[PDB]
Paper text:
The bacterial flagellar motor is a huge bidirectional rotary nanomachine that drives rotation of the flagellum for bacterial motility. The cytoplasmic C ring of the flagellar motor functions as the switch complex for the rotational direction switching from counterclockwise to clockwise. The basal body is made up of the LP ring, MS ring, C ring, rod and export apparatus. Here, we present two high-resolution cryo-electron microscopy structures of the C ring-containing flagellar basal body–hook complex from Salmonella Typhimurium, which are in the default counterclockwise state and in a constitutively active CheY mutant-induced clockwise state, respectively.
To obtain the C ring-containing basal body–hook complex in the CW state, we constructed the constitutively active double mutant D13K/Y106W of CheY (hereafter referred to as CheY**), which can mimic CheY-P to tightly bind to the C ring and lock the rotational direction of the motor in the CW state. The density maps of the LP ring, MS ring, rod, hook, and export apparatus in the CW state were locally reconstructed to the higher resolutions ranging from 2.8 Å to 3.8 Å. The MS ring is located on the inner membrane, houses the export apparatus and forms the assembly base for the C ring. In the intact C ring-containing basal body–hook complexes, the MS ring is more stable and harbors much more clear densities for the outer RBM1 subring, outer RBM2 subring and putative inner RBM1 subring, which are made up of 11 RBM1, 11 RBM2 and 23 RBM1 domains of FliF, respectively. In the intact C ring-containing basal body–hook complexes, there is one more peptide loop L3, which consists of the residues G310–P322 of FliF and is also extended from the β-collar region of the MS ring, bound in a hydrophobic groove that is formed by the α2–α3 linking loop of FliE6 with the D0 and DC domains of FlgC1 and FlgC6 on the surface of the rod. The interaction manner of L3 with the rod is different from those of L1 and L2 loops with the rod in the structure of the C ring-free flagellar motor. Thus, there are totally 11 FliF loops that extend from the MS ring to bind the rod in the basal body for torque transmission. These 11 loops are possibly derived from the FliF subunits in the 11-fold outer RBM1–RBM2 subrings. The more stable MS ring in the C ring-containing basal body–hook complexes indicates that the C ring is also important for the stability of the MS ring during motor assembly. Although the structures of the LP ring, MS ring, rod, hook, and export apparatus in the CW state are highly similar to those of these components in the CCW state, the protomers of the C ring in the CW state notably undergo inclination and compaction, suggesting that the binding of CheY** induces significant conformational changes of the C ring for rotational switching.
Residue numbers in the entry:
A (entry chain D): 1 to 89
B (entry chain U): 3 to 54, 62 to 78, 83 to 136
C (entry chain P): 3 to 21, 32 to 104
D (entry chain E): 4 to 256
E (entry chain J): 37 to 245
F (entry chain O): 3 to 21, 31 to 104
G (entry chain I), H (entry chain H): 36 to 243
I (entry chain G): 36 to 244
The structure:
């Protein structure tokens, strides 16, 4: 009820969002950086060949860590809906 | 029912007026019977008695429900007849006309009450 | 209640320091109409009883007045309900 | 007897109802479409039932241009109060949308302005957070109390009016921008530095950077930055509400 | 007591205000606001059709207001029907359990504000609060509680859209709408975590707590 | 029924242990009250037409009018309830 | 014992007011209409077939699905009531049985358990002890959940097409094109080459 | 057997109530309306022709297409009824046949089989005896499928134009130039030059 | 032969409902608003002047365009109606002729031929004998085609500006600069200096002649 | 003076056209178009909500109509009570200030075009322009004025965007999009100079 | 009132510059009040509709 | 003000009809009282008089009730109408000029004119609800 509880609500929610999005974004960033440094080493420059492995890497990311995200988000939503009638004002 | 309690008094008055009307007409019809006593009822006391029962209990469907199933005062004679008939024409004719008038008044009052209860509902 | 009497004395102290409504009016009108109707009905029952002094003229006139008052109350209720329905139909 | 003078009651209960309902239809949270219309109408009716008997009743007929002037006055007062209150949520929405746009969340607006493709999701997040905070600080009760209080300052009866006062509400349009800049400032600046850092990377071997490495990094950095910045809005939320409220108190009079 | 005609007239007139009692004195407002907000959240403004949600809200309200209705019937309707309590006293007797139910769920701040706006004297205990103060205080408290519940409801459905947009933006697909992708995932979430049982139980507890 | 007697003994056990309003039940009770009033008036008219002694014409008419008033009560309550239900169900969330 | 004919007429004509409510809450109309709306959202165009056509088609589908229940009601309740062999109340009680079975067969256990919890129900026992006022909201909740389960998996192929087209377009280089604009004709092609309408009706019917 | 006059006018007014449903689910209005909406979406102009203009055009096209069926109904059914030659029941039965034939001409056998199998209808010998309750949903489904086919096919030339302009812009290095702004005037020019409106209406009429 | 007063009132009030349909399918309005719907797209601002401003401007322009037709209808048909020298049926027959001529002069022959063939009409001796059922949809079709022609022609100078600005931006190596935002103010410049609105309305009015 | 019921009918009917009066007769279109163009300038098409822009334009319109409202009050509101003039002579007398304002804000070319669109040859004087010719001409003049003000607003933001892009290109960066960098600088320039208050002051001066 | 007499003299200066209850009454005032309330409701509805049409704009 | 002024003529005429019928009923009641001159009013002149100057009463004063327990009481009250004497037709020994034919003709005429006033006022009020209703 108190504004401290509200702002905590937003923080924990958006940290959950950060945890959900961090693996995919970080995998894409690492793949892009690796392809870019390889291009710099080989002196190859086409703006389209960096887009190819990124999709494959990010799609594999759901294969490997997808169940973890799905279990984390469901637990968050379940706990939020269960604690809903105790943060009422 | 509350509807009965509102209309109980006028219904009982109307029924008592009809019964006394029948008694007075019986007195008129038997005017010539030698030895006939003129009978009548005291309207107010009987109206008190009626205004002031246990349906037997029905356990199932086959069980049969309970089956349902006034005091006459002699008129004081005025003139002594030889055949023992105490019916006086004038007295009972006036009483008959009065009872007819009061029956009409009771009908009017009961109809007015029902019509008011109706216009309360109409809409 | 003991606490209720405490509250009464508190409101009396409030009056000391300091030194009807539409629903009330409608309740008063309903009470007046019902009292008139009950008076007419009681007089009619007294006349039907045979008690002396009650004239049929007065009974019939009082029943007439009671009917008119009932009809007035019915009309007021009808309009009031219509006005309430009109107000509740307003789009905000 | 049996008078029940209807015109007196109607004139006593009408104009306060007009002002209360005018505030209701525009005041934040009380004007959200999710509330059924009958609930809003009943709240206005009950508030007027509580308030009106204490006020002096007006006698101007409903069939006169004076009644039209009165109705216009009540509508103006109500909408002015509600809108001045709404300005704070407008400012919060502006700050959130700008943080989100510096995230690169909706890049299609820079190339196709207003092309039916825009999602200010951060703006919505902080808008609903601001609504929750406003509910917590009981701002709506205050709004209702001030709606009642503006009578003593400005009675129902037609009173003369001023000018630059309207400008003030219009000039409040500056606040939406001015306060929005500060909220952002605590994050956009660092994001700016990040973009500057990306520029240093592009000053190296040409191409092979930006649109491939900049976007995910800046998205994650914006996310964690403003996730850490979330505790900061509440003092700024109270500051915004106080600014709107005392501006309203000063200018309505 | 009143004449039978007057009693019938009052009964028929009072039968009119049933929607007002349901909306302004009952648990209906919070449930309907929460349902509307949730429908706004999932991105399907016409999904459970208004009639389905209205029927569910009516059944929920009937299940929630059961003890209050029972107390009214045992204390007011039963003596009135048995000609023990007059028509003008059954209303006063039955308005007390509803008043108590409205009080418990109301809030001090609203009560203080509406006690000040009426220029009424000090209210040392809750037993001195009239209905003219409790009615709008209860209404405002219910509105605020419903909006709080809905606004904490809204957060996950916007979180999903945020992460969807960020993931789409990582790969450079800047011209893909995020709402169209997020809607199936929001439906999947609301299916997985018992979307309705948890919400139903949370609302019911929110009343009985 | 054998299962019916099982249910009777179960309700007896319920009474032993013991030693809930219903709107549908209340509507059923009210409809029953109206229907038995109408049927009683109808049967009284039946017997009075058949010529059975003890029945009076004024009582017949009064009972018929009472049944009419009761049915008008029911019709008005029906109208109010249907209007309230339609206005509640015509609302948008 | 039987109700008077005036009472029967009053009840019969009053009950017709709940016909839309019965059709929506108690029958298969809700699930079909929700699935159709979700499919319209999933097609990429929000109002291609007018609401009127979808509503009529959903009504016909609901009638065809519920025809066995209607036949059972007619055999059990309507026919013996119209021949003046049973009373109105007993006819309604008898006719509530096949509809109760239909509602139970598609009811989630958790929904029924929760709504029995909220109604203070204690020793329930046989599946034939659930009252109508408890069974109905549980059926509505189960129908909403099932409709959402169907919709979110109806969404899948169109998301696949959208993602494939966007990925191909951006990887090829044309990143300034709107992928949805190019994708919509392909969504229509997929829907017409699979016989999406016929298969969707088959799946909706076989869901019961 | 002939209905009394009051019953006849009751039936007439009640049937007049169902007019939009008959127009949408029994005539060619739905297919034309769907194709028009898809075409409007295809030009990149979501609100250029107002809805009322397209609705009026679809209504007039439907009237012209259904003129032979209306003439058959008038000559075979309505005219004898207006001259009191035949009753209303047999007039309606005779008027059903031409409309039924028209709807059967434009339905797909697979959808008819689906709705027959779903409704548990017994084997039906030939097209002569197919209930209207079976034919109407099948015809609606076939109309939906045909409309989607036509719209998807229509979507092709504008897709060609968009792709060619996007490629021309991209091969010039213009990386941040959106192709919609350049494509919309050329879409309008293409539709104008081929006499698009009259050609598309003629194609829709010829398909019926 | 004249209709009764009740039937005349019924027909008049019934025909009053077709006012938007008559305005769209029989007057100039369809060509105007559609062009506006495209012009706001050419300027790069879909917001543009508000929708109601454009609609009312189109309404005023339509009234000015149909002033001669309205005057001819008022003189030939409605004046005897008010001065009792004609019936309602004859007035309806006579007043439509100037409007039919106005519709025919802007009707392309190909569309008219298409709708004849589609109605299986017999050999029409001359324009004067063309049925309204054939003239109405053909007029609407020709109206749409003409509006699209005008809109595409309007789309030209803004395309010129966009192409020039994009070429200038790319020739300087400023490849990452979106040219839409830069070219929008120059489109506004072009519409202001040339007096785009007045010129466009004059062109539309002259086009109808 | 005609019947009271007809007066009520006419009044409630004329109440419907209130958005038409606000848009076509007052200046509301000008402020709303200026706000839309300014929002398009900063690069954020949803930063202030459409509701807030509409309300700000409404308040600006109310102030800038306050002199005309006062003239209406003097010529129509007051004498309608003293009954020196009423009904006809007054409604038109009260509308006269609107005519003066719209003549002031209307260009001659639009009026000339709309006159030759209505074959009104003998329109010689400038205070007897009919409403049918005055209204659409006034609307077109307002559109032109709003577009000119929008371009004037556009100039500094376009300059800032161009400068940011030029410095990015000169510094060696060829891939960094200049919009992301230039957006906060656009905002800090807009706030620091206090763009909003000067914009409203100029709009009020713009009449 | 003293201020009331001030207002009277002000209006004089302005002139210088310029140079029991029955059913019959109950029902009539009852109807007049109903009519005035309906008029107020309709005028407010028109004003609210105009305001919402203005605010539902698109800028 | 405007609506009050528009409906004022018929309302005042109907009130004057009511008062005239009260007077005629008083004449009919006193028809057998010896020494009672019949009274009547000139409807048109009194109607114009009430039109120009508002309705007034002879007395109509009453005890003030500041508290809620004060006993309410009112003294005699009557309209400000001029009660004129009717010219007798033929003499009578008792000394009253109430001729029953005249009384019953005026009673019936006043009855119809009051019903006419009710009809006109009701028509006007509907003629107004028709405009307002929407």
């Amino acid at each position: 009820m108190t504004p401290e509880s509200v702002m905590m609500m937003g923080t924990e929610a958006m940290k959950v969002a950060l945890a959900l999005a961090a693996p995919l974004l970080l995998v894409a960033l690492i793949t892009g950086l690796i392809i870019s440094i390889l291009q710099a080493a080989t002196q190859i420059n086409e703006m389209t060949l960096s887009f190819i492995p990124k999709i494959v890497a990010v799609f594999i990311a759901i294969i490997v860590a997808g169940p973890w995200m799905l279990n984390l988000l469901l637990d968050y939503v379940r706990t939020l809906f269960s604690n809903l009638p105790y943060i009422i004002g | 029912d509350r509807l009965d309690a509102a209309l109980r008094f006028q219904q009982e008055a109307l029924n008592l007026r009809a019964q006394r009307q029948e008694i007075l007409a019986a007195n008129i019809a038997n005017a010539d019977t030698p030895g006939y006593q003129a009978r009548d009822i005291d309207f107010a006391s009987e109206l008190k008695k009626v205004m002031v029962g246990v349906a037997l209990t029905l356990t199932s469907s086959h069980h049969i429900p309970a089956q349902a199933v006034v005091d006459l005062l002699y008129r004081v004679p005025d003139q002594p007849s030889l055949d023992g008939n105490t019916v006086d024409m004038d007295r009972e004719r006036t009483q008959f006309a009065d009872n007819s008038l009061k029956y009409q008044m009771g009908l009017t009052v009961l109809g007015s009450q029902l019509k008011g209860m109706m216009n309360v509902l109409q809409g | 209640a003991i606490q209720g009497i405490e509250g009464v004395i508190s409101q009396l102290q409030a009056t000391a320091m300091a030194a009807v409504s539409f629903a009330g009016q409608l309740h008063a009108a309903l009470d007046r109409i019902s009292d008139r109707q009950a008076a007419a009905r009681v007089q009619a029952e007294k006349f039907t009883l045979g008690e002396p002094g009650i004239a049929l003229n007065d009974v019939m006139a009082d029943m007439q007045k009671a009917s008119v008052s009932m009809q007035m109350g019915i009309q007021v209720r009808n309009k009031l309900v219509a006005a309430y329905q009109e107000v509740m139909s307003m789009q905000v | 007897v049996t008078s029940e003078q209807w015109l007196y009651w109607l004139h006593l209960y009408f104009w306060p109802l007009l002002r209360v309902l005018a505030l209701i239809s525009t005041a934040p949270i009380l004007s959200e479409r999710a509330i059924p219309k009958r609930v809003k109408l009943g709240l206005g009716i009950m508030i007027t039932l509580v308030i009106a008997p204490s006020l002096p009743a007006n006698d101007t007929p409903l069939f006169s241009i004076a009644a039209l002037w009165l109705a216009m006055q009540q509508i103006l007062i109500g909408i002015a109060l509600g809108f001045t209150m709404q300005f704070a949520f407008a400012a919060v929405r502006t700050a959130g949308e700008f943080i989100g746009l510096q995230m690169g969340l909706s890049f299609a607006t820079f190339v196709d302005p207003g092309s039916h493709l825009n999602m200010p999701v951060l703006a919505r997040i902080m808008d609903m957070l601001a609504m929750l905070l406003f509910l917590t600080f009981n701002g709506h009760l205050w709004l209702i109390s001030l709606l009642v209080d503006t009578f003593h300052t400005l009675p129902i009866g037609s009173n003369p009016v001023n000018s630059n006062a309207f400008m003030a509400l219009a000039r409040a349009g500056g606040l939406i921008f001015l306060n929005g800049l500060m909220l952002a400032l605590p994050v956009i600046t660092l994001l700016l530095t990040l973009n500057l850092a990306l520029g240093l990377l592009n000053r190296m071997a040409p191409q092979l950077s930006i649109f491939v490495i900049g976007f995910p990094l800046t998205l994650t950095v914006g996310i964690m930055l403003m996730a850490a910045l979330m505790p900061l809005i509440a003092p700024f939320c109270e500051h915004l509400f106080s600014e709107i409220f005392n501006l309203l108190a000063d200018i309505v009079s | 007591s009143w004449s039978l005609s007057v009693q019938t007239l009052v009964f028929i007139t009072s039968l009119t205000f049933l929607p007002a009692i349901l909306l302004m004195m009952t648990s209906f407002t919070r449930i309907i606001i929460v349902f509307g907000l949730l429908r706004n959240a999932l991105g399907t403004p016409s999904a459970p059709p208004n009639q389905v949600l209205l029927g569910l809200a009516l059944f929920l309200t009937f299940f929630i207001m059961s003890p209050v209705i029972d107390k009214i019937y045992v204390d007011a309707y039963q003596p009135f029907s048995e000609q023990k309590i007059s028509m003008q006293e059954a209303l006063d007797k039955g308005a007390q359990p509803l008043r108590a139910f409205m009080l418990r769920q109301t809030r001090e701040a609203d009560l203080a504000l509406f006690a000040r706006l009426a220029n009424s004297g000090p209210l040392q205990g809750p037993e001195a609060v009239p209905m003219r103060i409790l009615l709008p205080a209860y209404v405002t408290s219910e509105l605020k509680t419903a909006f709080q519940i809905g606004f904490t409801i809204f957060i996950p459905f916007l979180i999903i859209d945020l992460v969807i947009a960020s993931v789409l933006m990582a790969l450079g697909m800047m011209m893909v709408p995020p709402a169209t992708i997020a809607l199936p995932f929001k439906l999947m979430l609301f299916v997985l975590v018992d979307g309705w049982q948890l919400l139903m139980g949370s609302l019911a507890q929110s009343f009985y707590s």
